[model samples]
Target: KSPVFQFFDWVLRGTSQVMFVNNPLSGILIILGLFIQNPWWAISGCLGTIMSTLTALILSQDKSAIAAGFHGYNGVLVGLLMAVFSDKGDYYWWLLLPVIIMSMSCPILSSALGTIFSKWDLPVFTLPFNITVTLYLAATGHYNLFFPTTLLQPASAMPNITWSEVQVPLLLRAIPVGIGQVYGCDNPWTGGIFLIALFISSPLICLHAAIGSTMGMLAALTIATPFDSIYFGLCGFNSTLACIAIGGMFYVITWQTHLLAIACALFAAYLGAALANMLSVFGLPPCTWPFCLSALTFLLLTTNNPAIYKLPLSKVTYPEANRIYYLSQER
Candidate 1:
């Protein structure tokens, strides 16, 4: 009985970890949203996560990390990315074998990357996901085991830059979609489900996510980025992730961190825009590269400074919990 519940929680928490949320309801909602968007994709994520979780179990990696879903998030990303890049056809079902095999690499890479980051006391955010997917595409896309999606244009082709007139009415739709996109969702209803999940987990994170998503739009608008990407939250998802990390996930909540969070979001947005252009020539997706870069850089600022309060990785929870726990522990 305990084993069953433990496994269930592992699945749920693993799903939630993509947003850095620890809540099971958030996990449930996120998977539901994934299913709503594409059932095959959701199944892909489930299998990827299962492969990763089992890898951790067989390796006897830290039970705490495994239990909290740290090993599962990147696997989820790998699965979703696999589904997104592949077209539905006869070869599609064959994709599961690759997903299972590839997703297991995330758990191993996490430890390797985690140790490297620990040297500087920085968190290993999504380097595993970034590295895993990029390598998979390189390995498969080249050999033609998996065909590339049309979305990735060849490096030789000039990128198209037609910006649709921004629709004012969809502003509301974009906000939640921006938040939802963190977990590879594109639908607004899933966005609402994600928001409700966050609100139930931590009102502070929910509020910060709102602020982050809106800030993302502002940054994108400033640069005149393609409104098509912006509307689907593709342009804002990296910013949202960066803000969520810097704003509340890793540090003590403070006026200073809040300022830093806003800057981080801006930096992520700008970096993502730049990376998108550079990668387009190479037929690649930027894929949270900006968030990983910006979050790590901003964190180095606080972790090294004495005045800024930082949390140990193990102690990290929601923002309010970080604040309250530290306050209660310190004089």
Candidate 2:
């Protein structure tokens, strides 16, 4: 009702946009988790989000896009990465530059990509964040912009893994961890809160995320990926995001769509590893390259299939809404 409340609502929507939900309570859980794990990370994420909202307000005349938190999600993630990758030092503030730049760039990039992909009925979920963050990561080395004071430690040091470590419990645990880490929170407590937030938003989305993580882990195991990498959730996070995007957000949910989501997630896992290995030569972490690539892959493959290719935008925030809309259309 008030401007203050409206701003707060936008930030909350930004958090929901993190998982494509657009709900405020979902945002609160994410923020609570960030605060519980690391206050600085929370500040960075919130700062990015606010700056992004302001930038979108200034740059874009499209009120609908501004309300959708389209500009803020990328900035929120940029801020999260700054806190996650940098150490607790004075230099940590340096990340603000990228946060500002990426936040401002969000609307521009979204507009550009939307025009290109509009004909195909594809939404560019987080691809803007993916490209800008990857560029920032690459810039750190070539430009000496700022070094990451602390690198993300691998989940384990062991070179090999036994069957005991890759069980259902471990895979299940990796689900929340994978989701949290995507936003740069590594703590299991924060991860649990993130899981609860997802549950509150939509159990179907939560289930898709779990299925995604499981598929990622299984794919990594089948490919002989190191046990530690799988456990640490390196392979699962992209799959989780990709699954949520493809499973219900982009398409009408059905057995065919569900199967397609699983297949895409598994493909993302395999592709993430390959991309990670390639980017390692350039000192760049793969980030969400897998999700972007896999989403693109699915869209490209559906070029001929009008049923999957020409569906209208879900036009709703919650996955359940999309599902219901899809079923109603079938009738």
Candidate 3:
């Protein structure tokens, strides 16, 4: 009972982290939003969060991160994907075997990838989920236990991308779906739901989310990405996340940062299209690679550009673990 509130708080924050927030109410709203859209996605994501947070505590990973729920979001993301792609219907119980295994792997991978990228002060933004989920998807080909399902079935069959004009009514309606696509749903109302959650967490992030989504839609429009996807706002999520990460969260908010954020959003649409096209050879989804890479890639340029203020590294504990530093704590 002693650690229960703290323990439970991490689980909520982990779920919240899916959209890059860390508030308990925001996390609960996220699950509720998913439930209204697809109950299983919510359930599967829960499986991911609990296992990963539990594992983070068990493994004694970084203490502040454990509390911040940084180690569990990657796991929850993998679970959401596992729910959709596992193809182990009816007998979905054993699917937990893979979820548990995969969830445990996320926190560990988060730690490992964080350590490696920390050398360059990169945050490794969901690279753990990207790596973990793609490997699981790839391995499903040969494995008997888990068959695979394609998220692209709808988009692939339709929307051949005809380089043309647009529909204002439907296009405007679908704009918010870019936010929904952050967690693999393309529901615009659910996107609105997430907007509320983001506002609750930080209106700055919420505002940029809207800006990013709009910028991404314009990019999608210009590039002539598939119409259905463009309408569903399927491909613009990287833009939303990139905008929030760049302008809203990572650095001080300013006109320059906002410009770079929009800049990243545009490139992500191109990068998202191309990376996804390349990965399609292996039938792999691009996941958050476009967002992470675009954000990380741009921030590295800014780490020196310094027109906008840059944050000091969160902590320089890669070569030094939290132990001795924690005990000796002095500025």
- Sorted by lDDT (best first), the order is 1, 3, 2
| TM-score of each candidate structure, all chains considered together | 0.92, 0.88, 0.87
Cα displacement (angstroms), candidate 3, residue 223, comes to 2.0
By summed lDDT, the worst window of 10 consecutive residues in model 1 runs over 142-151
Q: Write the per-residue lDDT of candidate 1 for residues 17-106, one digit (tens) a residue.
A: 777788778899888888898888888888888888888888888888888888888888888888887755423788898888888889
Which candidate order results from sorting by TM-score in descending order? 1, 2, 3
Task: Give the local distance difference test score of model 3.
Answer: 0.76
The Cα local distance difference test for each model comes to: 0.82, 0.76, 0.76
lDDT of 2 at 232: 75
The candidate that wins on lDDT is 1
Give the root-mean-square deviation of each candidate in angstroms: 2.5, 3.3, 5.7
Name the regions of candidate 1 deviating beyond 4 angstroms. 89-91, 142-146, 154-164, 302-307
lDDT of each residue in 1-331, candidate 3, tens digit only = 5688888788888888766677899988888888887787778888888998999888976788787788878877887777766555533676777888878888778778877887887776888899888888887743444465554421345455544565678787666888888887777778889999988877778888888888888887676676777787777788888888787566666687779888988888779888877887676778888998898888788355554754445742211122234336534
* Model 2: number of backbone collisions: 0
Of the candidates numbered 2 and 3, which has the greater lDDT value? 3
lDDT tens readout by residue for model 2, 1-331: 8998987788788766878777788888888998997887788888888887887778745877667776778878877776666654533676776677766776677777889988877778787777777776666653363555344232335466577655677666776677777787767788788878888888988888888877886788787787666667787888988898788777766677889999999999999888887877666677788998898778567445445623466475566787677678779
Model 2 spans > 4 angstroms off:
87-91, 142-171, 303-310, 314-316
